[PDB]
Amino acid sequence: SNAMAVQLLENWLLKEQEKIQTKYRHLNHISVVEPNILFIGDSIVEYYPLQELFGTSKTIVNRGIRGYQTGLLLENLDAHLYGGAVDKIFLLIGTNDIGKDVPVNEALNNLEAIIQSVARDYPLTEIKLLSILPVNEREEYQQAVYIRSNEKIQNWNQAYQELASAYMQVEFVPVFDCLTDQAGQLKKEYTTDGLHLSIAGYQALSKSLKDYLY
Amino acid sequence: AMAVQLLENWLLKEQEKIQTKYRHLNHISVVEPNILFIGDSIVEYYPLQELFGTSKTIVNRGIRGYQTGLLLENLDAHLYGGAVDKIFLLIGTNDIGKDVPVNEALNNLEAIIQSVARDYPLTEIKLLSILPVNEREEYQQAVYIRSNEKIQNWNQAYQELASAYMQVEFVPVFDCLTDQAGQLKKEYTTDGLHLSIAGYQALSKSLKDYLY
Amino acid sequence: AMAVQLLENWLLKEQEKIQTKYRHLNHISVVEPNILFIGDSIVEYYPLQELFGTSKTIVNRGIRGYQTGLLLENLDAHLYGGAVDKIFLLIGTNDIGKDVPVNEALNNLEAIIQSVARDYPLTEIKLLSILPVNEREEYQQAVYIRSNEKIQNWNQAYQELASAYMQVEFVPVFDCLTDQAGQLKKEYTTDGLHLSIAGYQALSKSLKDYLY
Amino acid sequence: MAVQLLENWLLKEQEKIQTKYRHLNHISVVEPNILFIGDSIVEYYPLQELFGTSKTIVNRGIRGYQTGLLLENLDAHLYGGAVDKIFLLIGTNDIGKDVPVNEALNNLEAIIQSVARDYPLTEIKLLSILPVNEREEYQQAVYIRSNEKIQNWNQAYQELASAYMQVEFVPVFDCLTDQAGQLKKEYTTDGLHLSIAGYQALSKSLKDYLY
Ligand SMILES: [Mg+2]
Ligand SMILES: [Mg+2]
Ligand SMILES: [Mg+2]
Ligand SMILES: [Mg+2]
Ligand SMILES: [Mg+2]
Ligand SMILES: [Mg+2]
Ligand SMILES: [Mg+2]
């Protein structure tokens, strides 16, 4: 690598995120569907084949953005919310806070502020706060997994669970264990690069989430 | 006796026609019901779109004159959709009006609940309290043998049934609709039994939070 | 004669009740109609939501047994909204059924069109052809004195009236509902006059280019 | 060479999407009524939020795609037992890479023939390639594409469509141009890709072909 190229790639990620935020802000106004469920979060959400794995009878709208962290979501929360009859918001975020060494208390405070902001504007809407998903710690996946570890992820998940217990409208959704193998790693078949999910991974995640859609 | 029997025949014919309509519509409908409203004439004549709006797709499967037995026997006509979040059920005032024994009506309702629990396992049933009537003499032609004392007793039984089933929530709306004398408000009714638009506005306001 | 008068009285009472319902709903509806459907029982009973969907807000202002004169007299009950794009009007089969003189019905329709042109100047009116009936003897109870010959003559008059008014388009749907004998298809009808769900599917398909 | 490795980036991202689609084709829980196939403009198209879900429309677009890549990997883009229509938007990257028009048309003809045998009751809607905006400010995305080229390719697409009863040419180019014949500024992000206003205008133009 090359530090000039480092900056410009960081710049590439920022401009892609800004482009997607702009896209969502305009769709929020002109969309022809009413979201029953909004899926909000990071790359795992953006790339989730929601239609093809959950079907179309329940309208689930994607408001995920690659590389997102809790602070970015809080700052731009308006891009991720619309509709007159939102039953539930599914929130999957934090793996990138871990990958950037964001203090857990800062991430939590960010999540708490998101919950409170949603309560004001969407008072009858439930939030399903997903466990951060496991990673695969095999050497071959070190490039995507980076400083994430399943011990850190499990510690954050304990904190998310405690945060959920403080709000009647928030339910913690334990999906971590559904995606692990017997060594407590994200299953090889469920991953492309140790962090992101394969289609088998998304299928397994969807099976674990289905009941929470109702 | 003879003309009254022919009127009962009329009603049955109309109900059968509506059941056919519904079976056919369920098959080719261009919408996915988020919520199904099922019940008797108070449901059939409910102006759902104009009082709740269309953010949620709320589909009407009500039938005038319906009773719990008729609904059970024809339950297939009243259910469709791939992701029904909620079924709102308002029925029983015609069971009372026809002197159907409460235990029969409650067994019919339990069977409905168990059927939906099996076939629509993640769907919630919102079991409404039967609505109050107005017992004043001027409304006797519609109200007939119904009384608010009977209705409240049946509502207690509905509440108890709902308590036995995870997917069922009893929705107490009776009290929203009464005047200080415990009668369906005169302004809320057309004939002492059916609702005026003001009655439907009051009912809608009471149901709004149960939609989520 | 006593009972025939009572049946007339029954219908009159129900129509008045629906007019009151609509006047009240017009006042407090939570939706802005993009399209109003106005007319007789074929409109009242039209499953608009489940056949057209809800991408546009389509509001039902039909009344069973309606005739052009009753609609004109009560036109206020059928119209509301701050930006109505289209009004679909299906009416006249009960004028024919009651032997209303054609010139009277056409004068009534012209008055309705002129009223809407004044009060809803940016709204398009879609004036549907009266639908065919089935003339087979099994359907004589509903069909009565209606005939496809009379209906087609009235439709020619409707087309002429529409041609005179800028914001009125005649919508020829009659031929979309007939079999090879020129009758309303048996599968399209419940009683020879009213539509089955298949008949409403065919009518909805033929209206789609005028709606969207 | 950084450009060699950017070419390599794109190829690897395309292969990853092909893998994803091939697996989805097997385990999808929906029966697509309409498949949208093509390049970046398709991948990034907000189909659900702009067309709604009265019909099940499935996205099988891939960024940077060209007619040859599509033909070689056509299996990744097709599935379902009841597909009413396929919408195909592709060619702007063939123009951008200076692929001979004859080569691109033979690839498209090969694609149409393959779909014909496997999906005989399915209509193919072959879209006109969309206009670009030729202003200098957009040159990083637009590159060697010109509206003159695009219109010439669209004439050829129209002729190819005329040779198959199952294929209808869908002329949307003119719906997206300004008075100078450029892609309208408010319809574009970078002179080539569409803004949401652009996708809404495209959707409005396509509605009569979808429903
Ligand atoms: Mg909680
Ligand atoms: Mg649960
Ligand atoms: Mg319960
Ligand atoms: Mg009072
Ligand atoms: Mg709920
Ligand atoms: Mg006159
Ligand atoms: Mg052709």
Side-chain angles (χ1 to χ4, degrees):
Chain A
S1 280
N2 167 292
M4 303 61 108
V6 165
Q7 228 323 35
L8 295 158
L9 285 192
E10 183 185 323
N11 291 353
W12 183 75
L13 176 63
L14 301 162
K15 210 190 208 86
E16 291 303 288
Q17 294 174 325
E18 178 185 325
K19 286 161 56 180
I20 297 162
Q21 290 164 339
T22 294
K23 184 187 193 186
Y24 285 170
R25 285 180 177 115
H26 195 161
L27 282 174
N28 289 350
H29 288 292
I30 71 164
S31 172
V32 305
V33 301
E34 282 285 4
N36 179 261
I37 311 287
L38 287 161
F39 261 68
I40 299 174
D42 57 21
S43 310
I44 308 296
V45 181
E46 189 188 335
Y47 310 151
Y48 201 140
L50 296 164
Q51 176 198 47
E52 297 185 81
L53 298 179
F54 288 118
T56 63
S57 296
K58 179 171 279 272
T59 305
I60 307 179
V61 173
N62 201 312
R63 284 292 183 273
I65 303 190
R66 68 200 70 173
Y68 237 31
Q69 296 170 236
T70 65
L72 301 171
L73 170 60
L74 175 61
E75 190 194 330
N76 292 281
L77 185 59
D78 66 296
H80 301 267
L81 299 170
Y82 79 101
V86 184
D87 277 4
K88 301 178 177 69
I89 291 159
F90 278 54
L91 181 54
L92 178 55
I93 197 160
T95 199
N96 298 326
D97 293 71
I98 293 174
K100 287 286 175 185
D101 215 18
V102 172
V104 62
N105 286 341
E106 179 176 316
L108 292 174
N109 284 346
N110 288 342
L111 285 163
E112 189 162 18
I114 292 157
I115 290 163
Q116 296 172 345
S117 186
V118 172
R120 284 161 68 174
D121 295 339
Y122 294 84
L124 298 174
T125 302
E126 290 174 350
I127 291 169
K128 307 298 178 185
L129 177 61
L130 272 60
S131 61
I132 301 167
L133 312 187
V135 295
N136 189 295
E137 290 177 359
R138 284 172 61 84
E139 193 195 340
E140 63 175 315
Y141 299 131
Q142 291 174 335
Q143 297 183 298
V145 171
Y146 195 46
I147 66 174
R148 300 171 184 75
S149 74
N150 291 306
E151 310 93 280
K152 293 166 173 191
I153 289 159
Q154 285 178 294
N155 290 336
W156 283 45
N157 287 339
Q158 197 165 339
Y160 279 29
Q161 187 179 50
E162 294 176 336
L163 173 59
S165 72
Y167 293 91
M168 290 304 303
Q169 72 275 21
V170 186
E171 185 180 20
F172 181 69
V173 183
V175 293
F176 178 101
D177 292 333
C178 292
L179 300 183
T180 56
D181 63 15
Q182 310 307 126
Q185 308 294 322
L186 177 61
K187 293 181 45 169
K188 193 144 168 282
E189 66 157 314
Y190 289 172
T191 193
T192 53
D193 62 8
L195 172 64
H196 295 95
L197 297 187
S198 66
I199 291 304
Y202 279 117
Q203 179 181 49
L205 179 54
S206 299
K207 180 174 148 93
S208 70
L209 292 174
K210 178 181 204 328
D211 282 10
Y212 296 89
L213 292 171
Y214 288 87
Chain B
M2 220 262 125
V4 170
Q5 171 69 108
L6 290 170
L7 274 174
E8 297 173 355
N9 290 1
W10 168 252
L11 174 63
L12 189 61
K13 286 185 208 310
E14 292 310 294
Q15 292 175 329
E16 283 170 11
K17 286 177 139 200
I18 300 164
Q19 296 161 339
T20 297
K21 187 187 186 186
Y22 285 170
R23 289 184 176 103
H24 292 171
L25 259 186
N26 292 348
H27 190 230
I28 54 78
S29 171
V30 306
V31 300
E32 282 283 4
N34 179 257
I35 297 178
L36 286 162
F37 265 70
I38 299 171
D40 55 33
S41 49
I42 299 157
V43 179
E44 195 186 335
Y45 309 149
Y46 202 140
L48 296 166
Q49 174 199 50
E50 297 183 86
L51 296 184
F52 290 122
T54 63
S55 57
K56 286 188 176 293
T57 299
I58 305 172
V59 170
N60 200 315
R61 289 291 183 272
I63 300 186
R64 87 283 303 265
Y66 235 33
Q67 302 177 234
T68 62
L70 302 180
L71 170 56
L72 174 58
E73 179 64 15
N74 294 277
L75 186 62
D76 67 304
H78 301 267
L79 302 166
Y80 80 102
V84 184
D85 288 314
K86 297 172 176 59
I87 293 162
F88 281 64
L89 177 56
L90 179 58
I91 198 161
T93 200
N94 299 322
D95 295 70
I96 294 172
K98 295 280 287 176
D99 217 9
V100 171
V102 69
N103 281 103
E104 195 174 301
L106 272 284
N107 272 333
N108 289 340
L109 289 168
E110 182 165 39
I112 295 163
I113 288 163
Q114 290 178 327
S115 191
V116 175
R118 177 190 58 245
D119 295 335
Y120 293 81
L122 300 169
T123 300
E124 290 183 350
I125 295 171
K126 304 306 184 184
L127 178 66
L128 272 63
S129 57
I130 299 173
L131 308 190
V133 293
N134 189 304
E135 294 170 351
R136 288 171 52 85
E137 184 231 65
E138 59 177 312
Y139 299 121
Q140 285 168 351
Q141 298 159 324
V143 170
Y144 188 42
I145 60 174
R146 299 168 185 79
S147 71
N148 293 309
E149 177 184 357
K150 294 170 165 184
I151 290 164
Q152 293 179 291
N153 283 342
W154 281 45
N155 286 339
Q156 288 170 354
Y158 281 31
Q159 195 177 355
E160 176 152 4
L161 177 58
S163 79
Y165 287 93
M166 290 326 103
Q167 294 304 110
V168 188
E169 177 176 19
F170 179 71
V171 181
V173 293
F174 180 101
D175 290 336
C176 297
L177 300 172
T178 56
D179 62 20
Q180 298 92 331
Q183 303 308 309
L184 180 56
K185 301 193 194 188
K186 296 188 60 185
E187 62 262 44
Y188 284 182
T189 190
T190 55
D191 61 10
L193 172 63
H194 291 99
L195 300 185
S196 63
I197 289 305
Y200 276 117
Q201 285 174 275
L203 176 58
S204 298
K205 180 177 166 177
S206 302
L207 295 181
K208 299 249 173 53
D209 282 7
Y210 297 90
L211 297 175
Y212 300 82
Chain C
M2 291 318 176
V4 197
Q5 163 75 122
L6 294 154
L7 254 53
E8 283 188 35
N9 290 345
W10 186 351
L11 175 60
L12 290 162
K13 190 69 173 259
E14 304 266 25
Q15 290 175 327
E16 289 173 336
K17 287 164 63 187
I18 297 162
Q19 294 159 341
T20 295
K21 182 186 192 189
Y22 287 170
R23 290 188 174 101
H24 291 173
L25 270 182
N26 290 350
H27 190 225
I28 57 74
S29 170
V30 307
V31 299
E32 278 290 355
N34 183 258
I35 301 172
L36 289 164
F37 266 70
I38 296 173
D40 55 29
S41 52
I42 297 161
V43 177
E44 193 188 331
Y45 304 151
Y46 204 137
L48 296 168
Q49 179 196 45
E50 295 180 82
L51 296 183
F52 290 122
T54 68
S55 69
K56 289 177 178 191
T57 302
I58 302 180
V59 171
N60 198 315
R61 284 291 182 273
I63 300 187
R64 83 277 309 257
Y66 236 34
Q67 297 175 57
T68 63
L70 306 181
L71 175 56
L72 172 58
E73 286 173 359
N74 293 277
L75 188 57
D76 65 303
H78 301 267
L79 299 171
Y80 80 100
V84 182
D85 184 29
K86 309 188 176 62
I87 291 161
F88 284 74
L89 178 55
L90 178 57
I91 199 155
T93 202
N94 299 325
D95 292 75
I96 294 168
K98 293 283 174 192
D99 206 14
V100 170
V102 65
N103 280 290
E104 186 176 310
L106 273 287
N107 281 322
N108 291 338
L109 285 163
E110 186 169 25
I112 290 163
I113 287 165
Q114 290 176 328
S115 190
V116 171
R118 181 191 56 240
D119 294 337
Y120 292 81
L122 297 173
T123 299
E124 292 181 338
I125 298 183
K126 304 304 183 191
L127 177 65
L128 272 66
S129 55
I130 302 169
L131 307 190
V133 290
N134 191 302
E135 293 174 351
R136 292 169 48 84
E137 67 165 60
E138 65 185 305
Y139 300 123
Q140 287 167 345
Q141 289 161 327
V143 173
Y144 190 47
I145 66 173
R146 297 169 187 79
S147 73
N148 289 311
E149 176 169 353
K150 294 171 170 182
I151 293 167
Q152 290 175 304
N153 284 341
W154 282 48
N155 287 340
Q156 182 54 44
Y158 279 33
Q159 185 180 57
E160 291 178 20
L161 176 56
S163 79
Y165 285 91
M166 290 308 291
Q167 286 178 29
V168 183
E169 185 175 23
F170 179 73
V171 185
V173 294
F174 178 108
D175 290 345
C176 289
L177 296 165
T178 54
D179 64 17
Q180 302 96 321
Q183 305 305 308
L184 175 60
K185 300 192 195 186
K186 287 178 66 63
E187 62 260 43
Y188 286 1
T189 195
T190 56
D191 58 9
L193 175 64
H194 294 101
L195 303 183
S196 62
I197 288 304
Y200 278 116
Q201 287 176 271
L203 179 56
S204 299
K205 180 182 182 179
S206 74
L207 290 180
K208 273 178 196 189
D209 287 350
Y210 300 89
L211 270 300
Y212 308 99
Chain D
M1 190 96 297
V3 175
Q4 143 84 344
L5 296 138
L6 281 200
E7 287 174 5
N8 294 349
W9 169 76
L10 178 61
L11 257 14
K12 302 280 181 188
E13 296 296 323
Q14 292 175 329
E15 300 176 339
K16 281 162 64 169
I17 300 158
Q18 293 160 343
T19 295
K20 182 192 190 181
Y21 285 170
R22 288 183 175 109
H23 196 154
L24 278 170
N25 291 347
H26 296 296
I27 68 155
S28 173
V29 305
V30 306
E31 283 290 356
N33 187 251
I34 304 162
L35 289 163
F36 264 71
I37 301 180
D39 55 26
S40 301
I41 297 152
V42 179
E43 190 184 333
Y44 309 152
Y45 204 136
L47 298 169
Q48 182 199 44
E49 296 185 83
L50 298 177
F51 287 124
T53 63
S54 68
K55 294 188 176 181
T56 302
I57 308 175
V58 174
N59 198 316
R60 286 288 183 278
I62 298 187
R63 77 206 54 182
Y65 238 33
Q66 298 177 48
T67 61
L69 301 173
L70 171 59
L71 169 63
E72 296 177 76
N73 295 277
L74 185 59
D75 70 289
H77 301 269
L78 302 173
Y79 80 97
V83 183
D84 183 30
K85 308 185 174 79
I86 295 166
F87 282 69
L88 180 54
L89 178 56
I90 199 154
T92 200
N93 298 323
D94 292 72
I95 294 175
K97 291 286 184 192
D98 214 18
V99 168
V101 67
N102 288 352
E103 188 177 319
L105 282 168
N106 287 336
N107 291 339
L108 282 172
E109 188 158 21
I111 291 162
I112 283 166
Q113 293 175 352
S114 188
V115 177
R117 56 196 163 246
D118 293 333
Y119 297 89
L121 297 184
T122 306
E123 295 178 1
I124 297 157
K125 302 305 181 192
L126 179 60
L127 271 64
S128 60
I129 299 164
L130 304 190
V132 293
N133 190 304
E134 290 163 351
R135 293 171 52 85
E136 190 53 26
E137 66 182 305
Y138 302 124
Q139 262 289 283
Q140 294 165 323
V142 173
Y143 190 49
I144 63 169
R145 301 169 181 77
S146 75
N147 295 306
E148 268 43 76
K149 286 203 261 231
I150 292 165
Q151 286 182 108
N152 289 336
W153 283 45
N154 287 337
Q155 179 48 57
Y157 279 30
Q158 188 177 32
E159 290 178 24
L160 175 63
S162 77
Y164 294 93
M165 292 304 301
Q166 291 168 348
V167 179
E168 181 175 27
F169 181 72
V170 180
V172 292
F173 179 101
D174 291 334
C175 296
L176 299 177
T177 53
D178 65 16
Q179 75 162 322
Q182 299 311 305
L183 179 64
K184 291 197 201 176
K185 164 264 206 180
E186 282 296 303
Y187 292 172
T188 193
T189 54
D190 61 7
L192 171 70
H193 292 101
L194 303 182
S195 64
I196 290 302
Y199 275 117
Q200 181 183 47
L202 177 59
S203 301
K204 178 182 171 65
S205 186
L206 290 178
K207 272 187 194 71
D208 280 350
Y209 296 91
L210 254 184
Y211 306 102

